[PDB]
């Protein structure tokens, strides 16, 4: 009823509607990178009290329609250690004690994995702390080869 | 046999390949008693080993 | 190993991780004489501002 000079309508003449601050922009924000929540199975199976909550989310990666074929194949090849036996991508976090923070962290992890799986021209940072010995062992195993014919 | 690979009993071990009654060099004429099975080391486990007992 | 455990043993692949024992810390006294400010963070559970009755 009361309004002064510093009112909400006078400072912004373009925004004077009664529902301009509650209109959900669903029709102009429905891209493929939204991650549908109806096909995700988020469950909480930990209540520690070292107070940290666990938020495990899994979904069938082989039946995801919001993901293209090449990016799905790439993210399945480069992350073949986190795939369950039934084709379930189990991703969990253990940072905060709240379930909302863990869910947001899992969503951010999924988003960065998706945005890095599609980008194939990615410069890999050459590390020398744990892969050098692996490369040395692989080279030494490949060096001891000097036969002529073997099948099987 | 694999000295490292048994998940249940720590002191025991598993069996992979076993032969018997090998006519000298003929390693293809003797009877079979245990089908060959490739090693299956765990992920977080260390470095397993398999010895050929002849 | 995944394919072996899948189409050779009819089970799931077990995973492990080389864990380490927790570090040693003396008994937290009431008045830590001559100790840095980070002495309370050594025994702190979570690094978040907790609130009780508020």
């Amino acid at each position: 009823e009361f309004k002064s000079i510093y009112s909400l309508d006078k400072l912004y003449p373009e925004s004077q509607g009664s529902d301009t601050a509650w209109r959900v922009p669903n029709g102009a924000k429905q891209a493929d990178s939204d991650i549908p929540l109806d096909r995700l199975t988020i469950s909480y199976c930990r209540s520690s009290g070292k107070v940290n909550s666990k938020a495990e989310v899994r979904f069938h990666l082989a039946t995801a329609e919001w993901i293209a074929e090449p990016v799905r194949q790439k993210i399945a090849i480069t992350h073949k250690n986190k795939i369950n036996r039934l084709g379930e991508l189990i991703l969990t976090s253990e940072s905060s004690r709240y379930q909302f923070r863990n869910l947001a962290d899992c969503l951010q992890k999924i988003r960065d994995m998706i945005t890095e799986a599609s980008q194939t021209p990615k410069e890999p940072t050459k590390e020398d702390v744990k892969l050098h010995r692996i490369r040395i062992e692989n080279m030494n195993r490949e060096r001891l080869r000097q036969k002529r014919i073997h099948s099987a | 046999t694999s000295l490292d690979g048994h998940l249940l009993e720590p002191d025991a071990e598993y069996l992979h390949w076993l032969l018997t009654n090998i006519p000298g060099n003929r390693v293809a004429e003797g009877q079979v008693t245990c089908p060959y099975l490739p090693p299956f080391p765990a992920r977080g486990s260390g470095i397993h080993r398999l010895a050929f007992l002849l | 190993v995944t394919y072996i455990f899948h189409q050779l043993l009819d089970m799931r692949e077990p995973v492990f991780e080389f864990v380490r024992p927790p570090p040693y810390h003396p008994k937290q006294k009431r008045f830590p004489h001559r100790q840095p400010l980070r002495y309370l963070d050594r025994y702190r559970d979570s690094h978040e501002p907790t609130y009780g009755i508020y």
Partner: peptide, 24 residues
């Protein structure tokens, strides 16, 4: 249940050439 799932939570290794192969 599968009887072959006897994994146990603790797994030991009886190989002396193991700790130095993992840089631990």
């Amino acid at each position: 249940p599968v009887e072959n799932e006897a994994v146990a939570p603790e797994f030991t290794n009886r190989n002396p050439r193991n700790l130095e192969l993992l840089s631990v």
